[PDB]
Amino acid sequence: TLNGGITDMLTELANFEKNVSQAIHKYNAYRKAASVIAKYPHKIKSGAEAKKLPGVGTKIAEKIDEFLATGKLRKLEKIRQDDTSSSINFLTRVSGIGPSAARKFVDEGIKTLEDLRKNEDKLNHHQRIGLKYFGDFEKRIPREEMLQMQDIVLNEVKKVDSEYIATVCGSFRRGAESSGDMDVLLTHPSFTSESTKQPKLLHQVVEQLQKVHFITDTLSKGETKFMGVCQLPSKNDEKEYPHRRIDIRLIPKDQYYCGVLGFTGSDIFNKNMRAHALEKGFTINEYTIRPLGVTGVAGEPLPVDSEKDIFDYIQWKYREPKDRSE
DNA sequence: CCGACAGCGCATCAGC
DNA sequence: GCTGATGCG
DNA sequence: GTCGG
Numbered sequence: 001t002l003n004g005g006i007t008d009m010l011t012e013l014a015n016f017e018k019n020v021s022q023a024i025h026k027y028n029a030y031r032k033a034a035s036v037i038a039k040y041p042h043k044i045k046s047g048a049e050a051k052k053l054p055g056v057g058t059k060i061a062e063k064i065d066e067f068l069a070t071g072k073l074r075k076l077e078k079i080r081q082d083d084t085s086s087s088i089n090f091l092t093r094v095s096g097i098g099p100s101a102a103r104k105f106v107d108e109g110i111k112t113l114e115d116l117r118k119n120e121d122k123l124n125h126h127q128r129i130g131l132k133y134f135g136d137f138e139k140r141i142p143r144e145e146m147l148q149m150q151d152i153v154l155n156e157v158k159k160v161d162s163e164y165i166a167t168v169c170g171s172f173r174r175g176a177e178s179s180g181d182m183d184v185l186l187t188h189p190s191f192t193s194e195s196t197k198q199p200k201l202l203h204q205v206v207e208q209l210q211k212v213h214f215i216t217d218t219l220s221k222g223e224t225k226f227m228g229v230c231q232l233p234s235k236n237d238e239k240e241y242p243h244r245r246i247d248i249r250l251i252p253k254d255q256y257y258c259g260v261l262g263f264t265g266s267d268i269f270n271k272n273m274r275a276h277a278l279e280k281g282f283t284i285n286e287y288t289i290r291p292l293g294v295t296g297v298a299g300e301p302l303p304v305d306s307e308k309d310i311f312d313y314i315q316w317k318y319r320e321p322k323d324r325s326e
Numbered sequence: 327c328c329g330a331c332a333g334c335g336c337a338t339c340a341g342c
Numbered sequence: 343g344c345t346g347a348t349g350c351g
Numbered sequence: 352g353t354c355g356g
């Protein structure tokens with residue numbers, strides 16, 4: 001919060017470029033500058049000072065000066081007053097409605113929560129469910145509730161097959177006191193980079209969580225990735241807990257460490273690390289780290305047995321998950 | 327100046 | 343039905 | 352929008 005005013009402005013500009021302008025590289029540029037400023041341990045006094053940080057350039061430096069003088073940014077004040085931009089930005093807040101769909105809906109006169117509810121028939125399943133729980137998905141999850149959810153998931157997974165190993169990652173693994181959702185990594189010795197000796201590995205788990213009424217709806221679902229909705233059970237007479245977003249991802253067991261690194265994040269930390277591995281001649285995804293040859297084509301996976309090994313290959317001093325919330 | 331910007335699973339549509 | 347491109351997160 | 356080369 002030391003520079004919360006500046007990071008807020010840059011985040012709003014980023015969302016505008018993504019939702020309205022459909023300029024994804026400007027979106028990431030604003031997010032990168034916002035992340036680097038967010039960890040800068042002084043109260044920024046000027047855009048010149050801010051520009052000394054990597055990722056903050058001339059254009060962002062000028063906007064920081066304006067904000068520090070007046071406390072506002074004219075470019076944003078105009079964007080906030082444009083009904084089309086304002087409607088597009090709102091509709092994208094519904095899960096499954098992206099910049100393209102949002103603009104298409106605004107084009108047809110669908111531009112408010114009310115309009116969306118009248119035209120449920122014009123939404124796909126994902127968007128239909130995002131609308132249904134739009135209000136609940138706006139609330140964060142206290143870490144205490146995350147611990148309750150962790151217990152339910154890990155115990156229900158054990159009851160299907162004691163060989164499962166479910167790991168909660170995301171902001172939870174990074175030590176956050178509150179989370180936007182719950183992210184679950186799943187492994188089973190039957191599923192490795194060498195064979196898939198068991199089918200319906202993920203399905204079995206989803207069905208079990210649906211049986212005990214933990215999972216309440218599904219956004220999408222494939223053989224290795226599930227995105228849906230969950231809800232803690234409420235005690236007698238007390239009010240219902242908010243519905244929550246949950247992702248479950250089954251990963252080959254022998255590739256757990258690249259998977260836990262990828263799903264722990266943060267998303268910006270991933271981008272920074274993966275970009276750096278390229279600078280040093282490697283390519284990292286949630287499964288492996290591979291060397292780049294003379295041509296840039298990926299080589300064979302390198303041996304990995306810990307999160308640190310991946311850091312070693314690219315000459316990075318290891319960083320605890322708590323220190324990866326960029 | 328200019329090219330690159332991390333990398334991927336699922337849903338949906340167009341084309342054959 | 344499959345294959346590729348696009349939207350989405 | 353930013354930055355290495």
Ligand SMILES: Nc1nc2c([nH]c(=O)n2[C@@H]2O[C@H](COP(=O)(O)OP(=O)(O)OP(=O)(O)O)[C@@H](O)[C@H]2O)c(=O)[nH]1
Pocket residue numbers: 169170171172176178179180181182183261262263264265266267270
């Ligand atoms: N949101 C987001 N997450 C990403 C991206 N790329 C990527 O690898 N991830 C990983 O996916 C994990 C789960 O997604 P998430 O949005 O819930 O991230 P989070 O747990 O840190 O934040 P949260 O507290 O709002 O839930 C992230 O921690 C991150 O490691 C991305 O582009 N956007």
Ligand SMILES: *P(=O)(O)OC[C@@H]1CC[C@H](n2ccc(N)nc2=O)O1
Pocket residue numbers: 095181245351
């Ligand atoms: P969603 O649940 O609303 O956003 C969460 C997930 C986590 C990663 C995924 N994501 C988002 C954007 C991009 N570019 N790549 C991703 O994997 O959104």
Ligand SMILES: [Mn+2]
Pocket residue numbers: 169170171179180181182183
């Ligand atoms: Mn999360």
Ligand SMILES: [Mn+2]
Pocket residue numbers: 170181182183247
């Ligand atoms: Mn998530």
Ligand code: NA
Pocket residue numbers: 050051052053054055056057
């Ligand atoms: Na800079």
Ligand code: NA
Pocket residue numbers: 091092093094095096097098
């Ligand atoms: Na959305």
Ligand code: NA
Pocket residue numbers: 180181
């Ligand atoms: Na979030």
Ligand code: NA
Pocket residue numbers: 136241242243
């Ligand atoms: Na609810």
